[PDB]
Amino acid sequence: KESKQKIHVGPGELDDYYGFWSGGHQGEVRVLGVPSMRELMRIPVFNVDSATGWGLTNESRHIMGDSAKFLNGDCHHPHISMTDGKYDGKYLFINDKANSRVARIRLDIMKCDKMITVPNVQAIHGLRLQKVPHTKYVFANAEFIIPHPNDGKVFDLQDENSYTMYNAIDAETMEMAFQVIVDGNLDNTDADYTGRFAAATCYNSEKAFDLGGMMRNERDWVVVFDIHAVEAAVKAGDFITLGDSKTPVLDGRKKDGKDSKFTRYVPVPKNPHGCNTSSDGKYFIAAGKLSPTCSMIAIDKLPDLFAGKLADPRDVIVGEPELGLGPLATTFDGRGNAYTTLFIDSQVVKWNMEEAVRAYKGEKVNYIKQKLDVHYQPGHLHASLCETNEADGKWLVALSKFSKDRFLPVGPLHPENDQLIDISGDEMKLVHDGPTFAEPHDCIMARRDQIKTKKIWDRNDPFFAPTVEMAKKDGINLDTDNKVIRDGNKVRVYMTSMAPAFGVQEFTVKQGDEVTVTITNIDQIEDVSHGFVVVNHGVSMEISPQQTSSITFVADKPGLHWYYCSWFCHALHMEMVGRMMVEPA
Amino acid sequence: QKIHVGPGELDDYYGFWSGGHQGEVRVLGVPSMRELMRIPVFNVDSATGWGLTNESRHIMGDSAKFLNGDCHHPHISMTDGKYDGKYLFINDKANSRVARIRLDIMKCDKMITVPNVQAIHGLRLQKVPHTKYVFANAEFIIPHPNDGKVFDLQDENSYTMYNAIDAETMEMAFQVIVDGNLDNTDADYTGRFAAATCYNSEKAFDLGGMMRNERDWVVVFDIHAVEAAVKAGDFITLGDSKTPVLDGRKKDGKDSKFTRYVPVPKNPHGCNTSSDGKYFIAAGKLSPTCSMIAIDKLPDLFAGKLADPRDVIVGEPELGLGPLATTFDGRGNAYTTLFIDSQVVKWNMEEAVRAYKGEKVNYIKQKLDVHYQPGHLHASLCETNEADGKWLVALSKFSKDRFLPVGPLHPENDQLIDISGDEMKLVHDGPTFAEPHDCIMARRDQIKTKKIWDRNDPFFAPTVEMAKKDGINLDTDNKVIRDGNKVRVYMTSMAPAFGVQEFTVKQGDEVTVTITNIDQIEDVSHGFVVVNHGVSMEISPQQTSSITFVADKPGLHWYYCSWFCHALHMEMVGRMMVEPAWSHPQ
Numbered sequence A: 001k002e003s004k005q006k007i008h009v010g011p012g013e014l015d016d017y018y019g020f021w022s023g024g025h026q027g028e029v030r031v032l033g034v035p036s037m038r039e040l041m042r043i044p045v046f047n048v049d050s051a052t053g054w055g056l057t058n059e060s061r062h063i064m065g066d067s068a069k070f071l072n073g074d075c076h077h078p079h080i081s082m083t084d085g086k087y088d089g090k091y092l093f094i095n096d097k098a099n100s101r102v103a104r105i106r107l108d109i110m111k112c113d114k115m116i117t118v119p120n121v122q123a124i125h126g127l128r129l130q131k132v133p134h135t136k137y138v139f140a141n142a143e144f145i146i147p148h149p150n151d152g153k154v155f156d157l158q159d160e161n162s163y164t165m166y167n168a169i170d171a172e173t174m175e176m177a178f179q180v181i182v183d184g185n186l187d188n189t190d191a192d193y194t195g196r197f198a199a200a201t202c203y204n205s206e207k208a209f210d211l212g213g214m215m216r217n218e219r220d221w222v223v224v225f226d227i228h229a230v231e232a233a234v235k236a237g238d239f240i241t242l243g244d245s246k247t248p249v250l251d252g253r254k255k256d257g258k259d260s261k262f263t264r265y266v267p268v269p270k271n272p273h274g275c276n277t278s279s280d281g282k283y284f285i286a287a288g289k290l291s292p293t294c295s296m297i298a299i300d301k302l303p304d305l306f307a308g309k310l311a312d313p314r315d316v317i318v319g320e321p322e323l324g325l326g327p328l329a330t331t332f333d334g335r336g337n338a339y340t341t342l343f344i345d346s347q348v349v350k351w352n353m354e355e356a357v358r359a360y361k362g363e364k365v366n367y368i369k370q371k372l373d374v375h376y377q378p379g380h381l382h383a384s385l386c387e388t389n390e391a392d393g394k395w396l397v398a399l400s401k402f403s404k405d406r407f408l409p410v411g412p413l414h415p416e417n418d419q420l421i422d423i424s425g426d427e428m429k430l431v432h433d434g435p436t437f438a439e440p441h442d443c444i445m446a447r448r449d450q451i452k453t454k455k456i457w458d459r460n461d462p463f464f465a466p467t468v469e470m471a472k473k474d475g476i477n478l479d480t481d482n483k484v485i486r487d488g489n490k491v492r493v494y495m496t497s498m499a500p501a502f503g504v505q506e507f508t509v510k511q512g513d514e515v516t517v518t519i520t521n522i523d524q525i526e527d528v529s530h531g532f533v534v535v536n537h538g539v540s541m542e543i544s545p546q547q548t549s550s551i552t553f554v555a556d557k558p559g560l561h562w563y564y565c566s567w568f569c570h571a572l573h574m575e576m577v578g579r580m581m582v583e584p585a
Numbered sequence B: 001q002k003i004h005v006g007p008g009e010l011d012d013y014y015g016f017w018s019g020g021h022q023g024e025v026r027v028l029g030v031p032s033m034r035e036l037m038r039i040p041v042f043n044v045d046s047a048t049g050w051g052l053t054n055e056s057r058h059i060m061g062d063s064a065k066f067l068n069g070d071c072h073h074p075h076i077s078m079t080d081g082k083y084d085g086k087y088l089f090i091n092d093k094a095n096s097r098v099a100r101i102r103l104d105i106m107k108c109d110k111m112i113t114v115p116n117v118q119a120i121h122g123l124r125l126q127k128v129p130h131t132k133y134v135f136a137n138a139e140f141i142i143p144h145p146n147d148g149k150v151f152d153l154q155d156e157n158s159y160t161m162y163n164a165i166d167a168e169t170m171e172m173a174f175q176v177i178v179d180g181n182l183d184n185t186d187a188d189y190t191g192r193f194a195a196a197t198c199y200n201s202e203k204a205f206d207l208g209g210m211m212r213n214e215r216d217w218v219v220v221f222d223i224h225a226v227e228a229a230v231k232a233g234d235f236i237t238l239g240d241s242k243t244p245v246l247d248g249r250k251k252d253g254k255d256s257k258f259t260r261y262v263p264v265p266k267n268p269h270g271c272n273t274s275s276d277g278k279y280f281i282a283a284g285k286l287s288p289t290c291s292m293i294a295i296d297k298l299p300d301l302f303a304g305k306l307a308d309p310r311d312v313i314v315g316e317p318e319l320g321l322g323p324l325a326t327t328f329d330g331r332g333n334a335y336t337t338l339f340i341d342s343q344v345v346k347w348n349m350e351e352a353v354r355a356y357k358g359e360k361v362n363y364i365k366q367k368l369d370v371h372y373q374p375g376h377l378h379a380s381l382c383e384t385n386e387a388d389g390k391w392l393v394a395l396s397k398f399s400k401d402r403f404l405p406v407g408p409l410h411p412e413n414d415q416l417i418d419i420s421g422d423e424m425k426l427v428h429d430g431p432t433f434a435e436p437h438d439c440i441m442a443r444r445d446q447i448k449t450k451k452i453w454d455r456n457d458p459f460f461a462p463t464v465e466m467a468k469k470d471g472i473n474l475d476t477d478n479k480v481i482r483d484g485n486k487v488r489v490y491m492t493s494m495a496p497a498f499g500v501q502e503f504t505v506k507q508g509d510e511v512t513v514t515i516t517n518i519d520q521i522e523d524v525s526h527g528f529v530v531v532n533h534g535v536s537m538e539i540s541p542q543q544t545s546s547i548t549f550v551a552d553k554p555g556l557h558w559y560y561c562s563w564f565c566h567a568l569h570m571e572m573v574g575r576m577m578v579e580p581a582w583s584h585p586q
């Protein structure tokens, strides 16, 4: 009834929830403790991390594939895998708008373990997960219409072969499952609580490239996907492929006004943005952005819509409440209220969904409960467990783009303001302003008990299994060996490390040799991480307890070159060093 | 003392944290301990494009090829022994660099690779009469020349050097060859003396060798003597570097004019100047002590009026297991991390001095448990004669069970401690990524930042020069300049529209995009990302930023604004059209 949760997490006390923040155009994922709002860990994903060597090590570059050549990413939408509509703590997925990727993070090790470049698209933006029966598919929007093929003969966005596609990735294999060509474009997406339906907002129904063109239509739409119908067509072989990708491609466009089997287009005003599934599974709610509304699609009416039982796609709209200026996203407390960010008015508005549905029928009922000022210009917002049937109505985070005077000045570039709001009672209460770097757009919270992590690595972990395989071809037992393998101009150093000593403390090579150093940390004490840096060679990486990590570099400078442990690991940490001796050409 | 900063309240101090082996500098508010900004330095930042933009790579020079750094020691420029808020400097141990950050724009504006050395570790600034020199230690002994003919650390031409960088020019000023090696460093309150700890007086490469001697030393530098030798032209140069090199090694037991070696146990680490200017305090690490060098006595030591370099030691208090660093409250107390005992020990410097003369007095005042294994520690304004005795941060290397589990890699634990009273009080546990080693605090009124860029700012003046060569007025022009296989796009940006919304190139063209943000509203930053080309940068109000990339893929390629700038931010986009190679001269 009253909103009175405690926010202080004192020394020695622990946070109640994990928070997983997108890193925005900085490209990483950040783990926070909630309600303290402190950053506990950074998980490199699309960024190159000097500390752990993500982007430099062989294990990381193998996961990134050819996209290892890119040093940037732009991530917005972190989501946790589900079983039976509840978080299962297995995986976190996130998009990369800058280089068109999806990444998977394993929540037991808190590392990115798979990455895919989505084929034949540009800019992976919207991303959310199937909820029921479990996260079989990752659903991802490609935002920008492009020519097909994109070979430089045709540039017109109006061409019959210019379009974008909705993407489904197999969550477990991290291979593409299928793609659906759509009209217009794609902004954000969500899924239902059965597995049959997904939905995405579109703001460029006009297929224009200019600002005024993209705002011409009074209504764009939410495109709804009959995933069962897509799956049936794939199983029957009723698909095409594009370019050199084997991914099954289904055509979800309207042809001469005739609907595809795979899609329905529900008109929604106007350049709508957020696309959020209510926790009771009743509605896809589209945030109206240029229209001061949200539109509520009754998921219960979608089978009739696809069966041809409804005379008009607008018939699945059962509410369209007027809320305020610039609605961008919606979340849920599991008590029947929705909470929507108003970018222009700079507020969070709390409103009762069933009352909004009755107001749409002509009933005189006030569905707006409260408007709370936020600081300033909120984008997305997220209530604890909102993406699950266990939405607990405890905490809300609103992620606001202009912090202005809310923090000390730090130069021309400002932090975002991610504000923690207590929603446990009848009144929302602002309790903490959290400055963050580079515009997290969205975040996701999980109860402490939904996340189970490893304290030390398993020696059979898939994360470094290819390196274990390399060692096997060299006849190396990584748990014990300290040896230097010579192979023409290639040199493969294998060593164990146990604080405060590297297992190989010197080695000699020829100028120009390509050197690979593989280190296995055989300490068993939790938290005794080691590092490895080769001075003046651009080489740096983490080796945590029982991990094997490897890095490759060319020894292009004759002479003595020191290497050292970068992770303070022991009172003799400064002395944990070695020498690479490079004999001149 | 208020410990919690509520919504709408501001922090009272800035904190500048080192980013450790992550390579950036982090700006925190104190006492909230929240991170307000990240300043990329040695890391590549996807968000702002540091390491990708032409302006950043120009500042990095040839070292722009490295994607890593390892920074430990951030320090703020001083005038008359007080922070003046102009510059922050920090080391790079990984690739042997020093970087300068301009505190008005909160960006690294200068970087230097220190010549003929390996691993820049210790770094601190001259205090008096102002920060003319940045002092930096090269940690590892190497051969000179390091050409692969000699590897022996015991060769007469194998050594390391102490380094002085001109703070304003960010060019080398001089280097001093030393015996042993170099760990941490600090400077006095006169400008004459600096000092550095050494742990490898043995010139060894193995753990046992490096621990062999019961004492190493702190080496003291007479900067007046170095300066006088440099003006007299009495120096040599190494390799292709023109930096004056002076010889501070002993030769057959005889001291050089530039250095004195004060025996100190044992593999000492921290080297900290007391805020009253009396002492260089070396933390004994493998010896459970700190050693106090009376800066008073250094002139006499350099004049030969003392029988034993130890005679400048006036205190050696026994404190506990693994002393690593010392800081100061400005009330006559010192605070020392004990890495092994996992504590901060508060002690009275004058009473330790009296105890050294046999007067039995208990100089130890309190020991506070920290969590766990503290390295460096920093009290507010400790590096100045304004040491205010309010806040202390202890930066601990093992956080274990102090935060929620996050997998095998744990955060560090930087703990905020109230030292305003007689009793140290632990108030906040602050988790941090990648091992900040040290940090530095400044009062809010010691830092003055710009809200909008100046159009003549040196950060992008080279880009303005390039534009002028093309006849461009960056404040107004939206033009595509063609120059063979180079294409130079110049545009203004004003939310929510790029001033050039489309341009066409040939496959293989080298494209430079230069964008000047002509919005005047504070906080209205723009971004620029080219999809699937690895291209990303920030353009803040009144900044010009530029980036260069190869249009290696035919077809249409979207670009977009990455910084939420406007209600129509999703629609602030453009298109690069790349004509296929088969349609152009092979």
Ligand code: CUA
Pocket (backbone or CB within 6 Å): A499, A500, A501, A529, A530, A531, A565, A566, A567, A568, A569, A570, A572, A573, A574, A576
């Ligand atoms: Cu291993 Cu420090």
Ligand code: CUA
Pocket (backbone or CB within 6 Å): B495, B496, B497, B525, B526, B527, B561, B562, B563, B564, B565, B566, B569, B570, B572
């Ligand atoms: Cu410009 Cu968003």
Ligand SMILES: [Ca+2]
Pocket (backbone or CB within 6 Å): A203, A204, A205, A206, A214, A215, A216, A217, A219, A220, A270, A271
């Ligand atoms: Ca539209």
Ligand SMILES: [Ca+2]
Pocket (backbone or CB within 6 Å): B199, B200, B201, B202, B209, B210, B211, B212, B213, B215, B216, B266, B267
């Ligand atoms: Ca020694």
Ligand SMILES: [Cl-]
Pocket (backbone or CB within 6 Å): A188, A189, A273, A274, A275, A276, A329
């Ligand atoms: Cl959304």
Ligand SMILES: [Cl-]
Pocket (backbone or CB within 6 Å): A335, A337, A425, A426
């Ligand atoms: Cl309620």
Ligand SMILES: [Cl-]
Pocket (backbone or CB within 6 Å): B184, B185, B269, B270, B271, B272, B325
């Ligand atoms: Cl120090």
Ligand SMILES: [K+]
Pocket (backbone or CB within 6 Å): A401, A402, A403, A414, A415, A416, A439, B564
């Ligand atoms: K912002």
Ligand SMILES: [K+]
Pocket (backbone or CB within 6 Å): A568, B397, B398, B399, B410, B411, B412, B435
């Ligand atoms: K650590």
Ligand code: NA
Pocket (backbone or CB within 6 Å): A063, A065, A114, A115, A116, A174
């Ligand atoms: Na992959």
